[PDB]
mmCIF file of all heavy atoms in Angstrom:
data_model
loop_
_atom_site.group_PDB
_atom_site.id
_atom_site.type_symbol
_atom_site.label_atom_id
_atom_site.label_comp_id
_atom_site.label_asym_id
_atom_site.label_seq_id
_atom_site.Cartn_x
_atom_site.Cartn_y
_atom_site.Cartn_z
ATOM 1 N N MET E 26 23.580 9.752 1.337
ATOM 2 C CA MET E 26 23.752 8.523 2.004
ATOM 3 C C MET E 26 22.390 7.917 2.166
ATOM 4 O O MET E 26 21.348 8.503 2.021
ATOM 5 C CB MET E 26 24.388 8.725 3.400
ATOM 6 C CG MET E 26 23.766 9.823 4.281
ATOM 7 S SD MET E 26 24.843 10.306 5.621
ATOM 8 C CE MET E 26 24.041 11.803 6.130
ATOM 9 N N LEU E 27 22.376 6.624 2.515
ATOM 10 C CA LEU E 27 21.169 5.829 2.839
ATOM 11 C C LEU E 27 20.974 5.884 4.347
ATOM 12 O O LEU E 27 21.761 5.354 5.096
ATOM 13 C CB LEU E 27 21.279 4.376 2.317
ATOM 14 C CG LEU E 27 20.103 3.479 2.662
ATOM 15 C CD1 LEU E 27 18.936 3.818 1.831
ATOM 16 C CD2 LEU E 27 20.470 2.035 2.434
ATOM 17 N N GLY E 28 19.906 6.474 4.839
ATOM 18 C CA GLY E 28 19.682 6.648 6.223
ATOM 19 C C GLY E 28 18.862 5.536 6.868
ATOM 20 O O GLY E 28 17.916 5.048 6.274
ATOM 21 N N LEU E 29 19.325 5.098 8.061
ATOM 22 C CA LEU E 29 18.714 4.040 8.776
ATOM 23 C C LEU E 29 17.994 4.597 9.979
ATOM 24 O O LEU E 29 18.485 5.437 10.699
ATOM 25 C CB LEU E 29 19.735 3.015 9.229
ATOM 26 C CG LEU E 29 20.556 2.283 8.189
ATOM 27 C CD1 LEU E 29 21.704 1.528 8.804
ATOM 28 C CD2 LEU E 29 19.646 1.345 7.346
ATOM 29 N N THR E 30 16.737 4.118 10.182
ATOM 30 C CA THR E 30 15.984 4.450 11.346
ATOM 31 C C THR E 30 16.045 3.409 12.422
ATOM 32 O O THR E 30 16.828 2.407 12.260
ATOM 33 C CB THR E 30 14.517 4.634 10.997
ATOM 34 O OG1 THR E 30 13.817 5.186 12.133
ATOM 35 C CG2 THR E 30 13.874 3.405 10.460
ATOM 36 N N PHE E 31 15.328 3.512 13.544
ATOM 37 C CA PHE E 31 15.420 2.535 14.576
ATOM 38 C C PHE E 31 14.756 1.230 14.136
ATOM 39 O O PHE E 31 15.191 0.140 14.677
ATOM 40 C CB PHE E 31 14.663 3.070 15.848
ATOM 41 C CG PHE E 31 15.464 4.097 16.564
ATOM 42 C CD1 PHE E 31 14.919 5.349 16.767
ATOM 43 C CD2 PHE E 31 16.734 3.867 17.063
ATOM 44 C CE1 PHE E 31 15.629 6.318 17.431
ATOM 45 C CE2 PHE E 31 17.438 4.809 17.739
ATOM 46 C CZ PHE E 31 16.898 6.069 17.898
ATOM 47 N N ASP E 32 13.820 1.235 13.237
ATOM 48 C CA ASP E 32 13.127 0.034 12.843
ATOM 49 C C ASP E 32 13.926 -0.806 11.786
ATOM 50 O O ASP E 32 13.522 -1.905 11.493
ATOM 51 C CB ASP E 32 11.799 0.382 12.225
ATOM 52 C CG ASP E 32 10.887 1.069 13.145
ATOM 53 O OD1 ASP E 32 11.326 1.430 14.289
ATOM 54 O OD2 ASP E 32 9.654 1.306 12.849
ATOM 55 N N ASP E 33 15.022 -0.244 11.311
ATOM 56 C CA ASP E 33 15.815 -0.893 10.212
ATOM 57 C C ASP E 33 16.933 -1.782 10.820
ATOM 58 O O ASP E 33 17.551 -2.550 10.024
ATOM 59 C CB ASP E 33 16.417 0.115 9.321
ATOM 60 C CG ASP E 33 15.421 0.557 8.226
ATOM 61 O OD1 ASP E 33 14.826 -0.359 7.581
ATOM 62 O OD2 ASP E 33 15.267 1.790 8.048
ATOM 63 N N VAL E 34 17.234 -1.687 12.138
ATOM 64 C CA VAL E 34 18.346 -2.403 12.686
ATOM 65 C C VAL E 34 17.872 -3.130 13.986
ATOM 66 O O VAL E 34 16.939 -2.750 14.613
ATOM 67 C CB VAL E 34 19.528 -1.433 13.045
ATOM 68 C CG1 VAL E 34 20.205 -0.961 11.741
ATOM 69 C CG2 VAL E 34 19.045 -0.259 13.833
ATOM 70 N N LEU E 35 18.640 -4.209 14.295
ATOM 71 C CA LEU E 35 18.467 -4.946 15.497
ATOM 72 C C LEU E 35 19.872 -5.172 16.126
ATOM 73 O O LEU E 35 20.842 -5.184 15.376
ATOM 74 C CB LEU E 35 17.754 -6.259 15.335
ATOM 75 C CG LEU E 35 16.193 -6.197 14.963
ATOM 76 C CD1 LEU E 35 15.726 -7.500 14.535
ATOM 77 C CD2 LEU E 35 15.370 -5.643 16.108
ATOM 78 N N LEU E 36 19.900 -5.434 17.413
ATOM 79 C CA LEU E 36 21.181 -5.754 18.087
ATOM 80 C C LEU E 36 21.410 -7.220 17.980
ATOM 81 O O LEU E 36 20.622 -8.052 18.361
ATOM 82 C CB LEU E 36 21.101 -5.261 19.571
ATOM 83 C CG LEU E 36 21.364 -3.808 19.775
ATOM 84 C CD1 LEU E 36 21.107 -3.415 21.220
ATOM 85 C CD2 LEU E 36 22.771 -3.469 19.363
ATOM 86 N N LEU E 37 22.577 -7.542 17.493
ATOM 87 C CA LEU E 37 23.023 -8.918 17.328
ATOM 88 C C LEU E 37 23.442 -9.483 18.692
ATOM 89 O O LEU E 37 24.179 -8.815 19.417
ATOM 90 C CB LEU E 37 24.165 -9.101 16.335
ATOM 91 C CG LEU E 37 23.781 -9.237 14.899
ATOM 92 C CD1 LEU E 37 25.001 -9.199 14.004
ATOM 93 C CD2 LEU E 37 23.034 -10.548 14.690
ATOM 94 N N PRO E 38 23.038 -10.722 19.090
ATOM 95 C CA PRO E 38 23.543 -11.301 20.307
ATOM 96 C C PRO E 38 24.996 -11.649 20.202
ATOM 97 O O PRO E 38 25.512 -11.978 19.061
ATOM 98 C CB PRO E 38 22.703 -12.567 20.411
ATOM 99 C CG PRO E 38 21.536 -12.370 19.563
ATOM 100 C CD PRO E 38 22.018 -11.560 18.413
ATOM 101 N N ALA E 39 25.736 -11.545 21.290
ATOM 102 C CA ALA E 39 27.167 -11.799 21.340
ATOM 103 C C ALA E 39 27.480 -12.561 22.573
ATOM 104 O O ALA E 39 26.590 -12.975 23.326
ATOM 105 C CB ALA E 39 27.960 -10.432 21.306
ATOM 106 N N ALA E 40 28.806 -12.895 22.752
ATOM 107 C CA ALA E 40 29.242 -13.552 23.962
ATOM 108 C C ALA E 40 28.871 -12.772 25.180
ATOM 109 O O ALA E 40 29.163 -11.579 25.284
ATOM 110 C CB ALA E 40 30.710 -13.832 23.916
#
Side-chain angles (χ1 to χ4, degrees):
Chain E
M26 50 196 166
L27 178 73
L29 298 170
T30 186
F31 287 121
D32 299 7
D33 277 311
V34 290
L35 292 168
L36 280 172
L37 273 172

